Design a protein around this ligand. Structure first.
Ligand SMILES: [Mn+2]
Ligand SMILES: [Mn+2]
Ligand SMILES: [Zn+2]
Ligand SMILES: [Zn+2]
Ligand SMILES: [Zn+2]
Ligand SMILES: [Zn+2]
Lengths: 162, 162
DNA sequence: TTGACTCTCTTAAGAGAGTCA
DNA sequence: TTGACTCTCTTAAGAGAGTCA
């Protein structure tokens, strides 16, 4: 809600509730042939999810609280960043999963960045494979690799140059 | 429907028309602090675009040919790949701009791959910066770099560990 | 047969808001 | 007030198909 005190109280209640989600250990590629361990705090698969939480999509949730007799609602991963600017360079700020695990709500696995920055982490080589993200990746992106390209650049005639 | 010879004739007509598009020389980052040059064959900004071409969206075009009284139509960048498989690993193949220039129709700047592989090239460090794409990038992706993250992972209490 | 427009759809990273009990 | 559902929207890489002359 409007007051900084009210916002801190929302963040604190959110953290307390998410802190009771089951902690699931995931072993993950870091890049460079190395492996690490992440501890994700995962929202349940089905109702009930926790005080204040409800599912609005297969992998989408919202957090809601009643303040001054009014309901206030947020995307479930946006709550840690309620005191941050909600845009950057004219682009909407988004909650970005460093662990690439949608159900996870561990704020130590989230950052707040443009949708382009967010998406791009899917292909990052990782913190031990050359990640250059200023807010560093926690793991190699799940889509990093050589790809599966069916056909490369080609011409039949002689009209084009690279 | 269309025979192999007829499909080859469609590709040849497409190449002959695109070959006459304005050729624009662009200096581009290759990764590793090096600069290279790409030559893009750019479809015009407004009609007329060239024989067989029409705009279906702000940055979308189609190629159309009528053969034996039947109208055939293709996405304007898909024509080089009409003799290739149209899916791989259960994913639809898409025309993917190695030059990251939508208006460009140079077939030496296109490859044919899943939409995820396609998107991922936006963040590639480039052919002289560590590209691991099996069909190699022609340039560093426009979105490669440290990013502009507004807020990183953080908690107010002590409920979480990474 | 052709040109120049029109419309909606896909994907996978993300969102907001309403209906009931 | 809190819970458990419903619906559609945004972005930026990509698509198919209709209408009229
Ligand atoms: Mn993400
Ligand atoms: Mn692309
Ligand atoms: Zn996590
Ligand atoms: Zn990274
Ligand atoms: Zn090009
Ligand atoms: Zn590459």
């Amino acid at each position: 809600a409007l007051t900084n005190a009210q916002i801190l109280a929302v963040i604190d209640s959110w953290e307390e509730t998410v802190g009771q989600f089951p902690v699931i250990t995931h072993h993950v590629p870091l890049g460079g042939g190395l492996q690490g361990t992440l501890h994700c705090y995962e929202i349940p698969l089905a109702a009930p999810y926790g005080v204040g939480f409800a599912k609005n999509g297969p992998t989408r949730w919202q957090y809601k609280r009643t303040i001054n007799q009014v309901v206030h609602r947020w995307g479930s991963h946006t709550v840690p960043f309620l005191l941050e600017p909600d845009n950057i360079n004219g682009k909407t700020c988004t909650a970005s999963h460093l662990c690439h695990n949608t159900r996870c709500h561990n704020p130590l696995h989230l950052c707040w960045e443009s949708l382009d920055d967010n998406k791009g982490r899917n292909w990052c080589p990782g913190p031990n494979g050359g990640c250059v993200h200023a807010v560093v990746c926690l793991r190699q992106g799940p889509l990093y690799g050589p790809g599966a390209t069916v056909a490369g650049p080609q011409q039949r005639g002689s009209h084009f140059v690279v």
